[PDB]
Design a protein around this nucleic acid. Structure first.
Lengths: 107, 107
RNA sequence: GCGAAUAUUCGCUU
RNA sequence: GCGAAUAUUCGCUU
């Protein structure tokens, strides 16, 4: 089950703000595993102001959308464009795609 | 965008029966393309009583779950277990997984 | 269109 | 862990 599957399955909520607060309450602190690289991340925040068509500056200096990044690097196609980004803060945060992350029992 | 992405994105509805009637109203008649085989199908019905853990009898006579079928035949992993099946009637209907089908402009 | 196998090289925090 | 390339064989309505 992906984080995206979960966001809609765990709690259903017609009021959008309430949906967003609750999902954020239900996800922040959990550990996800990306399906395309054997790394796990703590979900520190959910960025509702970003989506897969948003862009980031790569290690090397060039800019790419998350869409392009995941297709070129891992041949992972992201189908749902409306979904938020998950924020994981190391120690430049890693922004993860909910559709590409599996849930986990987590602290 | 997959059919699964669409089912949640197109119209939001807290009353479950209303969600189900509306999605069925919004999908029945549309043409989908499976992501893992270049075939298209008319959506004739949505089977809310089946899901990816349901089983069918293969051409050859053996029984498999949709989960097993899609993994063994196409290495397609189905992440969302709660989703309904799409029914396409030829001329034994083909049951399609919403998460594995792209939407299309359709009659 | 997705995929399997064997071999040989490769890419990968975001 | 997902994937790329070349070659050689393969599987595919559900």
């Amino acid at each position: 089950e992906t984080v995206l599957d979960f966001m809609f399955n765990f709690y259903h909520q017609t009021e959008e703000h309430k949906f967003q607060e609750q999902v954020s309450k239900e996800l922040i602190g959990l550990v996800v595993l990306t399906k395309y690289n054997n790394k796990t991340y703590r979900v520190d925040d959910i960025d509702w102001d970003q989506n897969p068509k948003s862009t980031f500056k790569k290690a090397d200096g060039s800019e790419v959308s998350f869409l392009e990044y995941y297709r070129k690097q891992y041949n992972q196609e992201i189908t749902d464009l409306k979904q938020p980004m998950l924020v994981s803060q190391p120690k430049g945060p890693a922004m993860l795609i909910p559709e590409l992350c599996y849930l986990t029992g987590l602290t």
